[PDB]
Each structure stands twice: as structure tokens, then as C-alpha cells.
Amino acid sequence: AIRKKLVIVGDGACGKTCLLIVFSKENYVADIEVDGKQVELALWDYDRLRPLSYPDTDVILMCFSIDSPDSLENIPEKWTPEVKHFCPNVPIILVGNKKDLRNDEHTRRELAKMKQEPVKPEEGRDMANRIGAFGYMECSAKTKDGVREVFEMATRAALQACL
């Protein structure tokens, strides 16, 4: 058994908390469950402070919603600098929340009223290679599409650090 920790971060948390509560099968403990080689993942008065670099964090999931390209463009300015300074060497996974509402009648039409359109996977990978991500992966909270593929990817990112 190997314990790895997963922080997760993004604009509005009805997009993100949707991502981790769907794996029931600010503190939570899921598993594999347990496919025979066991990997466990913990999630996100006196304060105890950790140096850098020996952080109690093995991988960050930077979340943006596909229905808001504002929430994608905020990534480099609002989320990345924090991680830059405080969690360096911690691998990142960029994550497009709610992939189901892309070509939709209600929400690409409502996005036009912002002079805008939904986020492409080109714009996603462009940001991922920009912020220095370990990888990218879109996923839908409500339709269960690509959800396990994020936690697959997160775990692979965590493990990769004889004689």
C-alpha cells in the first residue's frame, strides 16, 4: 500500500466538488478499490508548517470549467503563481470540468452574449503546456465521462518522482 496526496483547485466549487463526490463507490478518501496492487489517495488550534521542498502534497489538479473561458484564462494569473512559489516540483494536472455542456443549445448561445464561445481541447492543451502541466484531461461530472481517467492520470503523475 502506497499513500499519495491530491490537492485540487479551481474557480467555483460546484464544478470541482462535483468531480470528487462522484467517486463514492475538504477531506475524503477514495481508492482503486482495491485493484490488487493497492494505492490510496487522501484529498482536498496550533498550525504546523512544512518547508519547501518536503511538501505534504504529491499532485495538484488545477480545475477550470469548459463553459467559462474566463475561468480558464484566470489559471495563469490567479492559481499558477501560488503554486509557483509555494508548491514547486509538485506536478500539475489541468482539468476541464463539465465537458457535457460544449455543443449545447442553452449554453453556447448564452456564451455568445459574452462575445464568446466554449473552450476547445486546443485551448486546453495550450494552457497545459504553458503552466508546465504533467498533462491534460477533460471530464464531465454529471455524465460520468472521463472521470476515472483523471484519477488514473493523477496517480500516474504522483508515482513518477537501481543499483
Binding site: 500500500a1 502506497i2 499513500r3 474557480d11 467555483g12 466549487a13 496492487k37 488550534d45 496550533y46 498550525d47 504546523r48 508548517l49 512544512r50 518547508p51 519547501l52 521542498s53 518536503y54 490567479k78 503563481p81 501560488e82 512559489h85 509555494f86 537501481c162 543499483l163
Partner: protein, 469 residues
Amino acid sequence: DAGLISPLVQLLNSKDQEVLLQTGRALGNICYDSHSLQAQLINMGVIPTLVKLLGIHCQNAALTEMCLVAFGNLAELESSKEQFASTNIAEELVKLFKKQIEHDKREMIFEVLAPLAENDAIKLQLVEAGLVECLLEIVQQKVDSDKEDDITELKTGSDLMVLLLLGDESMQKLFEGGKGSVFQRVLSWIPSNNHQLQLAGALAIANFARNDANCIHMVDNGIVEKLMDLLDRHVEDGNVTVQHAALSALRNLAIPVINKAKMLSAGVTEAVLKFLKSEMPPVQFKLLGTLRMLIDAQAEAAEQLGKNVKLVERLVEWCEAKDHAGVMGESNRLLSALIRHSKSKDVIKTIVQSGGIKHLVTMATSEHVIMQNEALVALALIAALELGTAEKDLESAKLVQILHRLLADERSAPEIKYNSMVLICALMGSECLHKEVQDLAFLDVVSKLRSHENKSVAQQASLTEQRLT
């Protein structure tokens, strides 16, 4: 495969150097990147056997290297650390760290210590062995040296010292009590102009500062003053990492009631507020933390901080940021805390004007029950003292509607203080509009009565106030 390993492991008992080297090379691959097999090697159990080897063949170079890589790999498994703690490995790694000098050979030993150190019991063993001594000498030598190897050997030793101070037993041994012989030498890092040492020092301090007694004995010996000098150095720009570490220590030093006073007199509240402008959430967080701790029993301090319009305006600004929302929470609680501790009509008028009522109201519907009534109590104060100046913003916030929802509950005894904020808010003409929304049916049910004696009475009195006047 248990067929394969059993003999390979029984080979490890060989007094022959060459035998080990090969049986090692074998054991090596596979299990290379096969944690399944590595895990079985722990059960065997090879760990205590390997620690013995390292001990006997330390003046050898070839296997000693290979031995360390094993430990570094094995330590990544959970089972390993408890097993490692039985071992003499703490003593044996330090005894090695002294002997070896080359930069490459140390960094290998460091990459074993770091994961093994996470085990709180190993920490103590390492300190007892004298790792702390070596670590400090590595810092001292290489403070003003600018060799890229030397600055990273500094960072390792300094940050590892910090790590060691997370173990409660180990830390308490080093804080001797502060001032001791190590703690002193770590303190001196905060006056220093080595950006890393500043960081380490602040963090070390904060980690020392993790029980009432230690935090007292530090505030009295002028740690609070030294931390402010560090903050005053990093005000305009730019090392956010250090701002945080220093703030984070103050926050801890301001936990016990005794120090709350003493720190206000030294003027922490002033120096801390210089980072109101900061746009870095972790710095924003430990700012708001340290304020909320400084004002806890102190009313007059809270009266000035409440009156301070610069601050209160920033708080209402942070409350209304959708993200993070780690900093949103801490901010929202301070708004309550300013009102609650000062009990000042002025600080209320400051907050209602900054637009803070609508936030205190939405905090009353928080999932954490402590925060819930902090909002309700701060709202109780708002209504008792300055209901006129507040009542217009209060209808806007839909407070009356929330309180009815609150009092048909699944549930809390915090419903009492709501039945008081209802009783008190009732005497405002623009105010409810609770009779136009029918609370009387819920109040007489609760009158007769919750398991709490106190919950019954105000509710039975609220029944009489809601029928008569």
C-alpha cells in the same frame, strides 16, 4: 516468484562482499519498478537485515551506495517506516553523513533521510544521533557561498531542520527550552540576509511555537520583535514565501491568551496590516489569522481594528471574491469577530457602511456550526446596539427569511440565539415582516420544548413577544 526470492534473501546473510554485490544486482532487477515485489521484501523481512549490512560494510563504497537506493525505494512504501524505526538506521545514516564529504554522496544520503524523517519517531532518533549538529554546520559553512551545489546543500539542511521540528517529541527536545543551544542558532537565521535561512527560521519558529508554554516563553524573549523586522524587510517586494512563514509564526505565537496582550503592545497588529495590499492568498490567510487571534479577549484592540476603514473595506472585498475560498472564510469570521469582541457602535457603523451585513447574514447559513452562531451573535449585537443604521441592508440580505428556515431545523441548539435575534429584530418598523411571513407556528412548537432548558425559555418568551407587542 516467492520461489525466486526466498534464496536471494537467504544469500543476503553472506559475509562475502562480492556475493552480496551480485545477489544485490540480482534482487535489484526485477524488482525494479515492481512495488508488489518490494512490498514482499519488507515482509521477508529484509529491512532490519539491510540496516545490519550498511553497518558492517559502510567503509565499502559499492554496496553502501546500492544499500541507500534500496532504502530510498522501500521507504516509499507504508509498511517500511515502522520497520525502519526498529532499526539502528538513524544512527547509521548520521555516522555515514559525517564520514562522506563529496556533494554527490551526501545528496544520496539526504534522499534517504527526507522520507524516513516523515516518521515522527525517526525524527527523535536522528536528533539523538546528532543529525541536527551536522545540518547546522552545513548551513554555517555555506551561508555566503554562491556555488550552485552549495546553495542547494544549504536549502536541504535548512529545510530538513524545519521538517525535524514537526515531530512533537523531537522539537521539544531541541527547544531546550528556547533559548537553548540549537534554538538560538536557528533564531539567528531570521536576522540573516540569506533568503532561504529567513524562510527556514520563520518556519522553524512557527513549528517550535506549537504549544501554549513554548509560545509564551518565546514572546517574552523577543521573538515577536525579530519576526516584525523580517516582515518590515519584505514589505514592498517581494519574497511572498517568507512573508507567509513569518506571519504563520506570529499567528501561532498569538494563540494563548497571555501573549495576545503582549503582542499588541509590541505592535504586531500594525506591522501585519502592511500586507493588506498583498494579492497572495496564503499571505492574506495568515494575515487574517493573526488579526483574529490578537483580538480574541482584547476589546479595545478590536475597537480600533473595527474603526479602521482601510481594513474593513478589504474584508468586504475578500468576502465577495468567489474563490478561494480559504481566505474568504477567515475574512468573513474576522468581520464577525470585530463586532463581537469590541461590542462597539462605531465598529458596527463602519461595517454596515462597508456593506458587511449581507456577508454576516450568509455566514449564518454556513455548514460549520461554530461560524453559524458567530454570524448570529454578531447580528444579535448589530440589532441590540445599532438596529436603525442596519435595518435597510438587513431586509436586502433576506435575514428574516433565513431565520425562519433556520428554526425549522435538522438541526442545532444554535436555534436559540436565532430566536433571540428574531425577538430583538422584531422591534424595527421597516423590520419584519416576520408577521407577514408567519413564524408563530414554529416558535410555539419549539416552546414545548427542545431537550435544552435554555432553548425552551427564549422560545416561550418569543411566543409571548410575537402575540402581544
